[PDB]
């Protein structure tokens, strides 16, 4: 908990801890634990926020999102998850939480654990808050989170700018009336649909019926407000802007950055930005707009103008009256202009593309179903009843090809990775690439061009080394893989474990778009505590015993 964190000095946190402390190697010892229970249930014919009745939802504690997790830098977070769905297993991934030597609590069913069985299955996750900022959690059971199994994480800590009010979490998500599993089946043979609506902080207005409500945020005039924006969608990538206001970014994902004032922001799926907003405009009501760019290549909604209201306290009630100005087209790309407060530096003056450091993404339209995604020649397909961790605990090293294991034995070294976006395929799409267990450095990407321009780019050392940035590049957990192009990433092998790396569009990871970095398997087997081993076995026991009774087939990757 904080001892010197105030509106005038958000840079300070407590004795020996501030915005400049390297939070990757230094953690406050609070001795405090925050507890939550997530009770999952399945509801049919559920009337949602915009009036529309949905066939089926799967909810945490009977709400549209689960608990808002709130703790301090250095606390422990402990969550009991109880699966009262009918047929589905479940696993909760803590997106943005590195799980430093807690790989078994990562929530990747088929990798770190088996799914928690239905009809009362239970498991407790426990992790340390070694990073402060805005994150989120969600099911990793195929596309299950598309049904409602999702919520926010707020870990308090220092910030790179002074601010007066913390408005809290502000999750933005696409919203589909059809259920996740039908959408998985749909996207296996059909391009993904636009979203029926966009929920902002849990609420939206129906574009046809006018039912539902606008998110309504009250700003205190003259004050600096921290707003924690998240994109918790399954596919939609968002552009956001506040009419007649700027936003000053103070963090990207769970990494604080030097303050950057912008008129608008692109958020890929899974991305977060903490911003500061100054209520220094005439007291009034202002639209907060969700827009799309990129020639629909990274999403869209059937609601043409999803919005929230920003209301100055003391202003009249009612709807904003200035519809404002369309933001610049972000071309399905996040900004590489952010600079982490705590710096990292690495050499970018030489690189050789090789099979062992290249991950070629490929759309295969030649099998069944129609749309199958492959990485390095293979579509991922995990075994819920036999996670990689079971191999580790059993000394078995013959992993199925379908597990897309990329084994990395280097101890605490920087590793570089070239991701190629189907430069020779029929067509290519932007993908939000997400890495479990670490933040990566974004050293660079193919030239920024319009998202649907069909331009194809292969890494060329001769011209591309010069475009790389090794001097405190963007560091975060999610970044865009340009359509038709490439992305050059780097992470340090400081955390033994099995760590998924995949596109975060539910339909694409469903259809195979992922690898699994097996980081220091040898060190891993040694760091698994007896309590994690026993509990891993207990849960796998119960799943394996349940699965032969499940009425439904596994129809996708499992992720
Ligand atoms: C998870 O539970 C859902 C909800 O019942 C299942 O989704 C159904 O799946 C079947 C078989 O593919 C479809 O015919 C239905 O249309 C789906 N219903 C809905 C509302 O999506 C899904 O099969 C379950 N997954 C597993 C492996 O148990
Ligand atoms: C997001 O929505 C939540 C849920 O409605 C809001 O939480 C409420 O905040 C108001 C104003 O402080 C309180 O009167 C309620 O008691 C809160 N409800 C709960 C359950 O927390 C939250 O304010 C919204 N976020 C933003 C940024 O406006
Ligand atoms: C959003 O919330 C604010 C805060 O409650 C509402 O502002 C009030 O609006 C009424 C008239 O509707 C005024 O009489 C009050 O003086 C306002 N309170 C404050 C603190 O300014 C506002 O109505 C809400 N906006 C909408 C459209 O629902
Ligand atoms: C921000 O969102 C608002 C509210 O959805 C948009 O306002 C609508 O603008 C359209 C386009 O001309 C009008 O036809 C509607 O009547 C407006 N609706 C309301 C409720 O007033 C606004 O256009 C959006 N601005 C941007 C820049 O996207
Ligand atoms: C889960 O929630 C249900 C429905 O509200 C409740 O009846 C049940 O007791 C809960 N189970 C547990 C173990 O919390
Ligand atoms: C991709 O597969 C090739 C075999 O064709 C292998 O040599 C290479 O190491 C693989 N790359 C990665 C990072 O898995
Ligand atoms: Cl993660
Ligand atoms: Cu995620
Ligand atoms: Cu994740
Ligand atoms: Cu993708
Ligand atoms: Cu994941
Ligand atoms: Xe590099
Ligand atoms: Xe990576
Ligand atoms: Xe990948």
From Swiss-Prot:
Keywords: Copper, Disulfide bond, Glycoprotein, Lignin degradation, Metal-binding, Oxidoreductase, Signal. Cu cation 2 binds at residues 95, 138, 504. Its EC number is 1.10.3.2. GO terms for biological process: cellulose catabolic process; lignin catabolic process. SUPFAM superfamilies: Cupredoxins. InterPro entries: Cu-oxidase-like_N, Cu-oxidase_2nd, Cu-oxidase_C, Cu-oxidase_fam, Cu_oxidase_CS, Cu_oxidase_Cu_BS, Cupredoxin. Its cofactor is Cu cation. Glycans are attached at residues 39, 88, 201, 216, 244, 289, 376, 396. The keyword Glycoprotein applies. GO terms for cellular component: extraorganismal space. Monomer. Lignin degradation and detoxification of lignin-derived products. PANTHER family: LACCASE, MULTI-COPPER OXIDASE. This is Laccase-1. It comes from Melanocarpus albomyces.
């Amino acid at each position: 908990e904080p001892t010197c964190n105030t509106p005038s000095n958000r840079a300070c946190w407590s004795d020996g801890f501030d915005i400049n402390t390297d939070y990757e190697v230094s953690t406050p010892d609070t001795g405090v634990t925050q507890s939550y229970v997530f009770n999952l249930t399945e509801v049919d014919n559920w009337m949602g926020p915009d009036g529309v009745v949905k066939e089926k939802v799967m909810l945490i504690n009977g709400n549209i999102m689960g608990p808002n997790i709130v703790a301090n830098w250095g606390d422990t977070v402990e969550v009991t998850v109880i699966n009262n769905l009918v047929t589905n297993g479940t696993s909760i991934h803590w997106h943005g939480i590195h799980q430093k030597d807690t790989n078994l609590h990562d929530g990747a069913n088929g990798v770190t654990e088996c799914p928690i069985p239905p009809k009362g299955g239970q498991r407790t996750y426990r992790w340390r808050a070694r990073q402060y900022g805005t994150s989120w959690y969600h099911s990793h059971f195929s596309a299950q989170y598309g049904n409602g199994v999702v919520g926010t994480i707020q870990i308090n800590g220092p910030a790179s700018l002074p601010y007066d009010i913390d408005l809290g979490v502000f999750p933005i998500t696409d919203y589909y009336y059809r259920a996740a599993d039908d959408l998985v089946h749909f996207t296996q043979n059909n391009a993904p649909p636009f979203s029926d609506n966009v929920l902002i902080n849990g609420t939206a207005v129906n574009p046809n019926t006018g039912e539902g409500q606008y998110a309504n945020v009250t700003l205190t005039p003259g004050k600096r407000h921290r707003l924690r924006i998240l994109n918790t969608s399954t596919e939609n990538h968002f552009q956001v802007s506040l009419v007649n206001h700027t936003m000053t970014v103070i963090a990207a994902d769970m990494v604080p950055v030097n303050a950057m004032t912008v008129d608008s922001l692109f958020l890929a799926v899974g991305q977060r930005y903490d911003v500061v907003i100054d209520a220094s405009r005439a007291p009034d009501n202002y639209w907060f707009n969700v827009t799309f760019g990129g020639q629909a290549a990274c999403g869209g909604s059937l609601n043409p103008h999803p919005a929230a209201i920003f209301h100055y306290a003391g202003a009249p009630g009612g709807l904003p009256t200035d519809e404002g100005t369309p933001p610049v087209d972000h071309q399905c790309l996040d900004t590489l202009d952010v600079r982490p407060v705590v710096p990292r530096s690495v050499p970018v003056n030489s690189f050789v593309k090789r099979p062992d450091n290249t991950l070629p993404v490929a759309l295969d339209l030649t099998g069944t179903p129609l749309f199958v995604w492959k990485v390095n020649g293979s579509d991922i397909n995990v075994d819920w009843g036999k996670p990689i961790i079971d191999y580790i605990l059993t000394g078995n090293t013959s992993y199925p090809v379908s597990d897309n294991i990329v084994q990395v034995d280097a101890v605490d070294q920087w590793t570089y990775w070239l991701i190629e976006n189907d430069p020779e395929g029929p067509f290519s799409l932007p993908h939000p690439m997400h890495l479990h267990g670490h933040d990566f450095l974004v050293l660079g990407r193919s030239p920024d061009v319009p998202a649907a321009s069909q331009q194809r780019f292969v890494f060329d050392p001769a011209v591309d080394l010069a475009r790389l940035n090794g001097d405190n590049p963007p560091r975060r957990d999610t970044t865009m893989l340009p359509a038709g192009g490439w992305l050059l990433l780097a992470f340090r092998t400081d955390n033994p474990g099995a760590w998924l790396f995949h596109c975060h569009i539910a339909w694409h990871v469903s259809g195979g778009l992922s690898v699994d970095f097996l980081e220091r398997p040898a060190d891993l087997r040694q760091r698994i505590s007896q309590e994690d081993e026993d509990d891993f076995n207990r849960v796998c026991d119960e799943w394996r015993a349940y699965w032969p009774t499940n009425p439904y087939p596994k129809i996708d990757s499992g992720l």
